[model samples]
Target: QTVLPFTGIDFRLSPSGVAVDSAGNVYVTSEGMYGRVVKLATTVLPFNGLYQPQGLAVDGAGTVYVTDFNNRVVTLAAGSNNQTVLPFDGLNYPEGLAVDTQGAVYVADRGNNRVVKLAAGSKTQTVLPFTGLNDPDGVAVDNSGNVYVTDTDNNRVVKLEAESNNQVVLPFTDITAPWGIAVDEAGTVYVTEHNTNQVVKLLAGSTTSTVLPFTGLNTPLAVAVDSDRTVYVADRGNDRVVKLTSLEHHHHHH
Candidate 1:
């Protein structure tokens, strides 16, 4: 369940966040205070002012958004070594990053236990005024700009409509400790169940989930899906990444 689209990456120490740009440049960030957000071999140097980076979400402009640990969301635009440090309120110990179709950033403020929405090119930070959310950790946005969050403490993934603050839960049996989430172009949901150490895929138009079989996964914390239904899991416990063909996604490719 792995493919080497590109190899020979000069792996850095404790690299965590991974994102790909339009031209196949890989942006990786370290999990340390003096973390390095390197653009592989092409751009050896990292962006400015990054401390303890976590998740990565790339925007349409090829900008890589970093969820800084207790710091501002540092944005490194395409082909630029420097970054623009964005300031916001209630971004306590931010962990995950996702930008909507409208370029709005959705951050899972783990410390504040809420998802903060920052308008594109705006400074105001507004909490998604929804209730029953606890320890929202990771975020993913669909083409329609719907926000999906890993309600970790709540052991579920919650979806928030883009226009309205409407909410719904993708519930499943035996699902405990949800950690990361991603939505594909077809509306199928992919979420990481940390405690179970596996990623589950929720078919579009259905609430039930089918746990994807995983081997060589340890404490998997993040999951993402491409337009082709290829599943990527960030296996933290194993300190490695795993890519899957996602057998469950057969005939469901968008």
Candidate 2:
């Protein structure tokens, strides 16, 4: 169900990307010149210079990664005090990010009209080949290493098989301006529709979608799900982050 926190975290002007870590701490990137990355309803991380930060992700180890639309990505180690810029060059308006189990990072290189990956322990970037993509925004990777991307302009989600690298467009239709995407441990997919002002989910192995009952979503841009099936969304237009738990999550307890 769509559940807003009793005391919602407000005051953020343009919350773009919201991700949750293993410890259930929610991370949000607030965009624009005076923007900063906030850790839930608490600390505003001491980032030296994060310009228009867009996409965000957290690894199993709690390492926080964020994309600055100004053409760079940065990371804050779990137990460190330093925020370091990643060593990849030529990123044009990167938006969403996802980290695989093995620590590899995937980025939606929107300006270049493609998606790229930085291997688990490598410094080079390799572009994934999905043709006819116009402004791909959100990206995700499941446990099996399959990559998922929201082909925003094409109005569809594309899946790249981990082993064979074959591309398949997800069968869900009318997905306008799909922005943020997340894949749970069970392979269920969640996405926020920027144009429709709604959130939807595709259960594992299902072709149809269930538009979540979110009443006041306004151009939500990013979504993230933790292992417990709790969902987090960055409601951009409303400038707030939202939390939701599926009925399936409650079933496990009852």
Candidate 3:
């Protein structure tokens, strides 16, 4: 693995979330009362009332979706600075954010202990059928519309299928305080074990895990995977975003 730390922008004050646009540009949210969402080397979004910007994602049309812990989800057009909040209500401390190919938006409503979805081009919202979800902190949607969420308090990752109410708990071990999650187009799953300070990868249809190497990772939170399978992680404790590329296919047996 080649470790590359994103530079040229100072996120030394808590880089909390990360997402990659189709153009391969990185977008990150600095967490705090003074937090701001910025596309690295691009403009910092000038918005008010964003107490803590947690997770963000870019859709096929390039619209950027951001989840604010202030109980709001906002969108920025492909080339605009202005942001508009989506018409969803009853959101509490929303964390991880994801935008599906169909323009649907998924949010991990942490404080509400559930995940919610806002359909594309519609005002209707659906609370995904999750039983006893305790503070789900991260979410991701695959190409087939499967919803993957990090059941934080439960120490597990759960999958909600696209067409049905069927849910499955991912098979992995040593998942303590899972915070961030991402699914590639091919359906491979990546999650950050915050308490364990590790990034675990579950390849498509594999039972074993390949724990990515990170030296002294402190509470890594959000993670993103580009088309090339390059992994980006928000190394929150170290105050920087780290990228990993060319992962070797070596499995670690428990």
Candidate 4:
């Protein structure tokens, strides 16, 4: 097993989701006191502000989008100037974030139990509300624009068509407190279950089956997959991040 050490810094509060850009720049989001969006970059970039931020994602052009739990989405321009992409007063506890190939932003509105998409140059909104979504948390978009969301309160993972307003493709109904979600190049979905302390995976077209199981995870809250298929899980309760190279031995042995 090969391990590489990355820089770690103490956050002001809860550090939620993290993403790395094509140039290897790391970005992190944290929950702030009031409704604000705080962004941290691997190297010094001018955009470093956040408020009650939860999840973060970076697009191909290195633009960072952060979800503010207090209720808004903030975007950090290439120069680091803070801009409120979505106002907190209009949202209710928005958490997870994902960006599509077209630079469209999708936010998991946790408190509202729905997902909202915003185009790159437009301020108009398209809401995608599902029936069984409860406290929807983490979200990720695949290369083909399929959206995967972690329904925290419902203990499930859901997939939706990018263009459809309310089309459900896959509704994984076998998780326990699914919190954070991510997708890899192969379209594999990785989800972190908060209450079960497990990391689960759903292949591109698998049923309600788990490709990876509960393996050495303690309160796994979020996940991020890199190009090499390496899975990085943020063990929130453990207060550490763990990397898993192989999921072959993750199932219960008994």
Q: Is candidate 3 or candidate 4 better by TM-score?
A: 3
Cα RMSD, each candidate: 3.1, 2.5, 4.1, 5.6
Q: What's the residue-level lDDT of 147 in candidate 1?
A: 82
Off by over 4 Å in 4: 1-13, 32-49, 79-89, 162-166, 169-173, 211-216, 246-254
Score candidate 2 by lDDT: 0.83
lDDT of each residue in 62-82, candidate 3, tens digit only: 787888877899888887768
Query: Which candidate, 2 or 4, has the higher TM-score?
Result: 2
Per residue, candidate 1 scores C-alpha lDDT tens digits across 96-162 of 8888878888888888888888888898888886567788888888888778888888887888876
The Cα RMSD of model 3 versus the native structure comes to 4.1
What TM-score would every model get versus the actual structure?
0.87, 0.92, 0.91, 0.80
- Ranking the candidates on TM-score from highest down gives 2, 3, 1, 4
- Local accuracy of candidate 2 as per-residue lDDT tens digits, 7-28: 3345555788888887778888
Q: List clashing residue pairs in candidate 4.
A: 32-52, 36-50, 36-51, 37-49, 37-50, 37-51, 38-49, 38-50, 47-80, 71-88
lDDT score for candidate 1 against the true structure: 0.73
Q: What is the lDDT of candidate 3?
A: 0.83
Per-residue CA lDDT of model 4 for 1-254, tens digit only, reads: 22223345344424467676765454555444643323333243343445566888888777877776447677776665556555323678888889888988888888878888888887788886567788999989898888888777766677776577454645454667778899988788888776667677777777764646435556766677766566766665554456666555433221
- Residue 234, candidate 2: how far off, in angstroms? 1.1
lDDT of 4: 0.68
